[PDB]
Structures are given as structure tokens and as C-alpha cells.
Amino acid sequence: KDFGGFNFSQILPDPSKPSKRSPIEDLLFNKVTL
Amino acid sequence: TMSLGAENSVAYSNNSIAIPTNFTISVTTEILPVSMTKTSVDCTMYICG
């Protein structure tokens, strides 16, 4: 991830967790309770 | 289980660009309904006649 200094780590999916979601998508699923 | 499409990991480098050489003119189509039939039902003949 050499994008010239830009850090899309909060939006790109996280492989070191299950369901393969980004940090922000994780908090979007944990903050909406069915 | 459905495939969501082909996998196309594209060759991002920090100093390489891809530029088109040729083009295609493509005509696609798109269909939109704009109107209904103008039915009209009287109650009195329907319910009673």
C-alpha cells in the first residue's frame, strides 16, 4: 500500500479478522442492532 | 454460491499509467415506462349495477 502518503487503512478490508471488513464497516455493523 | 464477477487485480505501481490507444463507440439501450392505461371504474355499476 504505497499510495503516495494516503492511508486508506480505515476503509480497505482488514484481512486479519473474519468477515473481511474494514474498520469502519465493523463499527457500522456493531452500532446497528437488529 | 454466486460469483460476483471475474477477479481483476490491476497493476498499480507508483509511476505507471495505462492509456487507451483505440476506442469503441457503443450504443446501449434503456427502457423506461412513462405511463399506464387510463382505467376508470364507477362504483355504482361495479358494486350494484
Residue with cell 358494486: B47
What experiment produced this structure? cryo-EM
Alpha-carbon distances of B9 from B4, B12, B13, B18, B22, rounded to whole Å: 14, 9, 12, 14, 22
- DSSP code, position B15: S
Question: Which residues lie closer than 8 Å to A23 by C-beta, 6 or more apart?
Answer: A9, A10, A14
Residue A26's SS3 state is helix
Question: Which amino acid does the sequence have at B25?
Answer: I
Cα atoms found within 13 Å of the Cα of residue B16, Cβ hemisphere only? 5
Q: What resolution, expressed in A, was reported for this entry?
A: 3.0
